[PDB]
Amino acid sequence: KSEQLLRIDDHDFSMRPGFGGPAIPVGVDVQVESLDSISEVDMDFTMTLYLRHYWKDERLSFPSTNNLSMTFDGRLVKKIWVPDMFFVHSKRSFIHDTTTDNVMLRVQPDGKVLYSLRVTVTAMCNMDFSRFPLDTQTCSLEIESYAYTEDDLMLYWKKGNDSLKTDERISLSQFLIQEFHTTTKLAFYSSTGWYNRLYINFTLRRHIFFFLLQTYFPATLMVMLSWVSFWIDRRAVPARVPLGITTVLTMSTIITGVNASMPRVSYIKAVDIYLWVSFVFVFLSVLEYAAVNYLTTVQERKEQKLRDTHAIDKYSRIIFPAAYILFNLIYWSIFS
Amino acid sequence: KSEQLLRIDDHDFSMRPGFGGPAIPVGVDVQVESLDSISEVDMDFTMTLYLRHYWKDERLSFPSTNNLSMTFDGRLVKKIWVPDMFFVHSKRSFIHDTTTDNVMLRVQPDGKVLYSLRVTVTAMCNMDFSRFPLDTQTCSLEIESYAYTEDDLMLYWKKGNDSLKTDERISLSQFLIQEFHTTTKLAFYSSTGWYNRLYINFTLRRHIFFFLLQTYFPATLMVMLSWVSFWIDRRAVPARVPLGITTVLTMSTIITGVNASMPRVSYIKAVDIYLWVSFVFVFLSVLEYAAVNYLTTVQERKEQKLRDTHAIDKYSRIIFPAAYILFNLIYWSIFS
Amino acid sequence: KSEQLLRIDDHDFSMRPGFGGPAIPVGVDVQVESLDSISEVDMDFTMTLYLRHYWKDERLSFPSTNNLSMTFDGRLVKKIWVPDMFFVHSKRSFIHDTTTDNVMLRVQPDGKVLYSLRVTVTAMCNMDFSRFPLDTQTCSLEIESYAYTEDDLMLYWKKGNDSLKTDERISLSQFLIQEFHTTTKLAFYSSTGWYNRLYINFTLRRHIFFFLLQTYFPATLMVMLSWVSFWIDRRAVPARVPLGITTVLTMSTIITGVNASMPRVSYIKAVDIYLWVSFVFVFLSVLEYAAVNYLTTVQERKEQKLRDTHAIDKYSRIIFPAAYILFNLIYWSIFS
Amino acid sequence: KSEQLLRIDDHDFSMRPGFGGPAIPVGVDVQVESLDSISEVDMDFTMTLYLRHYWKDERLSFPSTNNLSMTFDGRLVKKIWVPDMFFVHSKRSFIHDTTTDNVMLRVQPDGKVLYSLRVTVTAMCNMDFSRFPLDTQTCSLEIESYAYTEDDLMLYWKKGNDSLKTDERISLSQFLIQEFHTTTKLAFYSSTGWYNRLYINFTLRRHIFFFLLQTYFPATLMVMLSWVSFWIDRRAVPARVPLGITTVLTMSTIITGVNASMPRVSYIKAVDIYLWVSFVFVFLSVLEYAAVNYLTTVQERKEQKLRDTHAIDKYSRIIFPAAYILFNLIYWSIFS
Amino acid sequence: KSEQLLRIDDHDFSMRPGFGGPAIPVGVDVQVESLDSISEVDMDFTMTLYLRHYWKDERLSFPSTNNLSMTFDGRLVKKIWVPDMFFVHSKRSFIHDTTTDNVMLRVQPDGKVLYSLRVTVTAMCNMDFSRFPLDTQTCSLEIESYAYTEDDLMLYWKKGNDSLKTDERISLSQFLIQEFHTTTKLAFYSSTGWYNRLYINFTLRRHIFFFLLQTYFPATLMVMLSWVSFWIDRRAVPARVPLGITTVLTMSTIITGVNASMPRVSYIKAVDIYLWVSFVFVFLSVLEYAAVNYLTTVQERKEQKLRDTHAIDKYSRIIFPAAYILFNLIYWSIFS
Numbered sequence A, B, C, D, E: 001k002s003e004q005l006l007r008i009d010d011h012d013f014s015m016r017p018g019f020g021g022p023a024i025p026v027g028v029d030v031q032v033e034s035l036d037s038i039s040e041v042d043m044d045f046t047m048t049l050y051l052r053h054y055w056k057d058e059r060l061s062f063p064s065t066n067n068l069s070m071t072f073d074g075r076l077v078k079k080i081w082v083p084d085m086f087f088v089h090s091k092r093s094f095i096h097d098t099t100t101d102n103v104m105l106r107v108q109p110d111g112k113v114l115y116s117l118r119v120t121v122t123a124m125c126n127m128d129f130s131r132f133p134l135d136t137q138t139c140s141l142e143i144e145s146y147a148y149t150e151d152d153l154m155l156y157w158k159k160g161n162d163s164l165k166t167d168e169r170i171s172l173s174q175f176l177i178q179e180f181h182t183t184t185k186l187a188f189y190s191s192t193g194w195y196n197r198l199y200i201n202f203t204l205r206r207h208i209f210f211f212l213l214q215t216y217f218p219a220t221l222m223v224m225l226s227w228v229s230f231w232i233d234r235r236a237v238p239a240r241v242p243l244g245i246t247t248v249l250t251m252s253t254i255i256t257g258v259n260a261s262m263p264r265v266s267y268i269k270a271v272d273i274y275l276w277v278s279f280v281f282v283f284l285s286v287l288e289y290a291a292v293n294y295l296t297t298v299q300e301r302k303e304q305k306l307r308d309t310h311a312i313d314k315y316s317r318i319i320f321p322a323a324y325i326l327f328n329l330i331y332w333s334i335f336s
Ligand SMILES: C[C@]12CC[C@@H](O)C[C@@H]1CC[C@@H]1[C@@H]2CC[C@]2(C)[C@@H](C(=O)CO)CC[C@@H]12
Pocket: A208, A212, A216, A217, A220, A332, A336
């Protein structure tokens, strides 16, 4: 029996290696296999990965006439001491078990141990949609020991920045992913002490042209369409009135349609500002012709009682586009 | 073996410490890590947190030549007595188990015990949407012993109001969160007796300006647009009629669009009252011109058989806006 | 050890108390804590509650110099005999286990036992939507023994109608809840025999005014708006035609919008009948003016070849509203 | 102890009764309690039922001075041999366990055994939507032994067609259910051999009138409305043009609305054919008036340069309805 | 006892057969039972299948006076050595367990073993929607050993391309499935070594005619409808203006409706290009008439101050359709 080569029954494996002295170093490597989903309303993401640990234990040494190592599956884990890592700020997670538990242990003649397992985790990521669709988000995944302070266990990246590998075809449907890297930082708990924490960081971006074409293009076209009425004969009331009112109706349908297709986040975003400013421009263009028609009617009635282009149209033909151009300059200087 | 330092086999751990005498005090601390989601239709919320217990047991004392404590994981829990806390008014919950059970026990030489675990819970929160979108909601989470009355176990906050800590970046997507605090109260069960209950309270609010801009602004603009027809020449029937009917159509589309984007709660809310009053104003403006056209036609026919601005327009130009202003004053004095 | 006070090893606990003789009575009490959700398309509901059992077993008696009782948690359940209750017509259910199993046992010196546990259950409830939104539904939850017939186990409510308690703040978002009460009935299985079954009954109702304002009000307003054209000068074709066709378009949008917000139940309901009758009225009002215009044109052409209000408008002004009023009387006498 | 009346330790229960000789017959009965849901996009259904087995084993015989039988729960199952049935073509399933496992065993003095359990299963059902909404679907549930060929185990319906019972109130929200019955058939696996398979069959149908009123009625009404323009004076251009274009807009909104309410199945169905043919009719009616207006204008210009009803309207008034009637005859002769 | 015919206690089953020498070959067969679902936003699919292994172990040989084999269920698996296969790039999976674990073992007198189990798996499949709805996708499922390198275990398809069988009625609701086949490839891990990997490949396609009729047909019809105004008398302003503006409104509603029914993928696809080009054509047709009306008005005013078909219409009648035809030629030569 291979488990008799390790004196299992001859040691207390409820205490750590080196108990009573300096802390035992434990080195970590990570391989990311995929990014599974993201939730914008609930603000979290899901990832699948391999986690590997390295440490030394002299109680595990066995004699050999060679330099061959022995390999075990997850049934040995409950018989020896292993590190207790957990994921900070996570909502749910599990270890894969088909067709059997996805756990491996390899033990060297001198007591060096490698511990490997496959896991899926869902973690939180606070997001800010104030600059949507031009926003940028940063997320992280964090790794920590549950019960051992830095005085008993010293956790570190085994090879620095070479300790993280990512799959060549990692991708998300609605985001672009860039800039993977690792960091470390000490954290403090008033109940027990100081602990080491490791981080995995990355950044997300959207596709800007899709949103430009889908939202900003039609609004601008409808605003430009509402200026056509300034060049139409003011005596054609049955053609001036329906045009303005239908233009309002079209802009309202566009805004409702856009609202139905964005994530349900209930506070004010940049695209909303653009859309409602354009709606106000369309409203003002109807008020203009109302004024013109009233004034013309008054003039005609006065002339008959006593017995060309109106100035408002001439000024509006210049003033409306200039003000829209100035709004656009300010908006795009502010939101980049 | 460390479990032989505690005389495990030498005591009955199916009875409480101090059995037969006064109740044993048990002190509680809570650290909230995050707020995961909220459901407005089902009226509940989800939270993730650390729960810590403190008590003393003389049967656990062990000799030491030092003041060092021993630490265990969750396999020891089934061998000793521990408190049986549960969450009142909850729908589902679980304890995290990756990469192993997230449970810790620390035992002092004199028998003081600390018990720590990590848990996620979903709890109910009755809500009232009568003043939507200006409503305010209050929620709570409650903690109680399942089987021990106040005569056997005394449950209390360890440090009063300093016993609750919350994460610095706790947030929800559609709500603002404020005013965390703790309370206690005795409850009575006719089947067994009196029990101590602990509470965690907080308050939620919405973003008012988003809703103002999205709902109240367009309705008011359309009501103001329907008043334009009072200044148009009454002889232009083909321009007066289509304008009113298209204005009705636009207001109906706006109302349907707003209805599709609120949570599906089927009783009457404030915003509904605002919207349907505005719809009635738009309807009345079409009835006005119907009356005017009929009366003008009668007058002309009478004059021809025998062989300026109509008064109704002049009065309507004043009466409609005053009545809308009075409605707005009353509405906003009532709903703040 | 407290489990040695009960002679556990000295009795066969795979047989019932009183085996071989009359049936053992078992009394039941229920406390409802909350109503969690309801599903109209799948026709089921979810509930969370406490279930308590009472019976006597002389094999459990122990000596005492006092009248104190002993309390156990769920680890004792597998060592003694307990009743096997299950929920009839249910789809899924589970027993809460945080922070430990929510099970209690209390044993009196003379062998009286109390058994308590906390459970969540989803059960079916056949529904009829023919009179929507004026429908009423009745639901029930049923409790039965799986393996013991009335000859071996007699199941009954411990205190009659006082055996059911409900929480003071029980509520559902879209329903009103009323009239909780209990009943009993015998059921028969051809495979094994007769069994006792217990019932918990309640009733659900909707908020009628919300639905009135959201659906019936706009339809009636549009039908009334289509009658305006009967008072308009028949020589204004460019004002009579667009009005009818836009009125049809508005009514169609209203009907689509209403259809998108009701539960997806694919058979005919009362509100559908109301809406499609109103649509038919709006269609008929356009056919009327088509007839009037054709006849006027014929008359003018005839008069010119040879070389006031038309009767159809005068009759329509009376006939349309009377017929709508009669439809409303019949409809509301039929559907209450 | 009742388990000592059966010589449990005295037989190898890892082999079947009658090992080494002819196959052992096993008889099956089924009671369906409910139909829980159906998924049209994923093409599956869910059902809840009781499954009962009957067979004889002489190793289970025990002496009795009477004809009373002994009853056990599911803890005995792991100590004796039982049949290994499984559900073919299923996606997921489980056995109910509240408040304990829903399993029963009854053993007669002579070794006759009854085995009963309660189970929920989700199974696939390939569907064809080509004739929607006039389609008919057939589904089945299949039962088979996992490891024993017909040479070792003979599986059959205990009582033929009397072996299946269904609940009196079984129903689905959007379907009608009819024609339950059972069948049997042999299947062949090249890896191991021939096996017996049992079937449960039933049929589903929709409510036709709901779909008629919701879809076919409005389309036909709009097609009939577009024919009104053939009777309108050809000199009223501002009344002929808006009518056709608004009629197109109404038909497009109707089609979009209908599309949003059917199950998302992306291939061509009958109702789509009806709707797009009607759209083409509405398009052609606008092309007609375009032609008429152009020709009239040419004639007038020619007459002035040189210095009644147009035939196209007269022919269209007959030709359009006849062609629609012929389309309807062919369509309804093809799709029933 | 049948487990005493195999000397279970007489061998260490924690090491592989042939330990210390050449690798042991293991042969694999697969039978696909169904394709359960596909997720376009999350980019994955689900499948249910039978997995079978073949290998030889001399420690399992037993004497027989015949050539009969012994069969076991899944309780034997934990007592002997078996291969540890797992699914690469998968998100979740499980082994069916109703009414018992769906596992079988068959052992020949000479030590040949067959191992069979039933499993459901969800795997990732990166997709590209740039050519939607004319796109083609390829997916695969991959099988690998977790802990043994090619030096210890040699994994291969038992019968080459005859090793894969698929069900005759396998289907998906919105896709067509074709071209199943198998491949093999070596993979390299820097932590442990080289491993053998097996692949199952297939291809998916859509139904093109459904999408043609639903999207491309209405857009083209509306573009053709906007050309009607070039043949209408330029003096009929109240008929030329409403027609263009309503045509814009109809096209906008069509585009919103189409957007609401495609999978929510936020980057630019071919159908979007088609739709927005058609929208631009409709916009240009309104700008044309604006120009024509302005120029006519100028001419009339000049003539009066001093005291037929306009050229722009004549050129537009030719130029618009030619340019649309050229766009269509280029588009369909590019996207096939
Ligand atoms: C072309 C369009 C969208 C389509 C019409 O509404 C016109 C605007 C004009 C301003 C443009 C904008 C696209 C996004 C631009 C290029 C901005 C960016 O650098 C984005 O990061 C700055 C100015 C923006």
